[PDB]
Amino acid sequence: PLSQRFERIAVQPLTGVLGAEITGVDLREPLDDSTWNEILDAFHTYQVIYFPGQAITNEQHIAFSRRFGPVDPVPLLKSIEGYPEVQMIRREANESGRVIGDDWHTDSTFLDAPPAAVVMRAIDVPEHGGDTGFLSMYTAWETLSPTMQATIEGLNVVHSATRVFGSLYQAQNRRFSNTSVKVMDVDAGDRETVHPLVVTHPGSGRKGLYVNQVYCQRIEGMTDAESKPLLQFLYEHATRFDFTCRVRWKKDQVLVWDNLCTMHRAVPDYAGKFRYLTRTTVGGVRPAR
């Protein structure tokens, strides 16, 4: 049982698939080795973990994030004054632009080495509205038939940011506001990189599906017509409701998600209400089979 396996923290799973609430620890302070190792174990098992009631400073947020790996801010988001490492998911009450992250994805997979994790901190969130969905790409992979696994396990996939800040974004109407999003070079938006469709997580050693509808363009080697259906099936499969969990925010909730083996999604159900979280990004290494 969790109560006896964990001696320094308390772990309460959110679903039978992923997600867990962690209590019994003070993120204002340096973590001792035994406490950190339990958090890291829970992180690898539950893939998204969150800590209610952690009223921390920007420096403490950064220090906690550093336990997971080096900081490596994502390219698109603005930072707060004085802290380049601390980026903003901020939406003013009156804004009407596109909501950041409102499609299932994982972050910045157009990079040669996308983030390994993100540590998000709620600053000011609505009493209701603005939950975040998560899902497990371990589960998505593990629930494919043996025949479908054999069929796709050796494929590679082309990623780019073209629909977020490259040529395709610039040729359409739904735009982000300047509250949290920077102006970007279109050529950087169009730059392609190739990642495996199935990857091995370096911490857990487990295989997971690695495709997302925001940044994936096509299966490498295939035409668009050939790719379109396999990719669309995999998006529908991965985002099956029974592979998900739903996290509700409260002020001072600190959450870590695994940027390799989960996906996540914003929920734009709080029009007219201010919502502000900060986040630090933990750098990763090239996705690999």
Ligand X SMILES: C[C@@H](Oc1ccc(Cl)cc1Cl)C(=O)O
Q: Which is nearer to a second copy, 12 or 232 (CB)?
A: 232
- Residue 173 CB-half CA count within 13 A: 1
Q: Is 146 among the residues that bind a second copy (CB under 8 A)?
A: yes
The rounded distance, in Å, linking the Cα atoms of 202 and 73 is 21
Query: By rule CB under 5 A, what string of x and - marks binding of each residue 85-114 to Mn ion?
Result: ----------------x-----x-------
In the numeric block, the tokens 């599906």 are attached to 209
Residue of 161, 103, 93, 175 whose CA lies nearest to 132: 103
Q: In what order do the strands lie in the sheet with 244-247?
A: 244-247, 132-136, 262-266
| Binding span for ligand AKG by CB under 6 A among 100-108, 192-200, 202-210, 211-219 | 100-108
Q: Is 76 among the residues that bind ligand X (CB under 6 A)?
A: yes
Choose the one of Mn ion, ligand X, ligand AKG, none that binds residue 108, judging by a C-beta under 5 to 8 angstroms depending on kind. Answer: ligand X
Please check if 237 is assigned to a binding site. no
CA 107 to chain centre: 5
Query: By rule CB under 6 A, what string of x and - marks binding of each residue 223-262 to ligand X?
Result: ----------------------------------------
In the numeric block, the tokens 């539950």 are attached to 46
Please check if 195 is assigned to a binding site. no
Give the other-Cβ count within 10 Å of 197's Cβ.
22
What DSSP character marks residue 82? T
CA 30 to chain centre: 25
Choose the one of a second copy, ligand AKG, Mn ion, none that binds residue 89, judging by a C-beta under 5 to 8 angstroms depending on kind. Answer: ligand AKG
Residues in contact with 279: Cβ distance below 8 Å, sequence separation at least 6, in sequence order: 77, 86, 87, 88, 89, 118, 119, 120, 121
| Size of the residue set binding Mn ion (CB under 5 A) | 2
Q: Is 89 among the residues that bind ligand AKG (CB under 6 A)?
A: yes
| Size of the residue set binding ligand AKG (CB under 6 A) | 8
Chosen residue from 96, 145, 172, 173 binding a second copy by CB under 8 A: 145
Q: Is 157 among the residues that bind a second copy (CB under 8 A)?
A: no
The rounded distance, in Å, linking the Cα atoms of 55 and 60 is 10
Chosen residue from 100, 197, 245, 261 binding ligand AKG by CB under 6 A: 100
Note the residues at the interface with a second copy (CB under 8 A).
Answer: 144-148, 150-152, 154-155, 219-223, 225-226, 228-230, 232-233, 236-237
List residues forming the annotated binding site. Answer: 105, 107, 132, 249, 264, 275
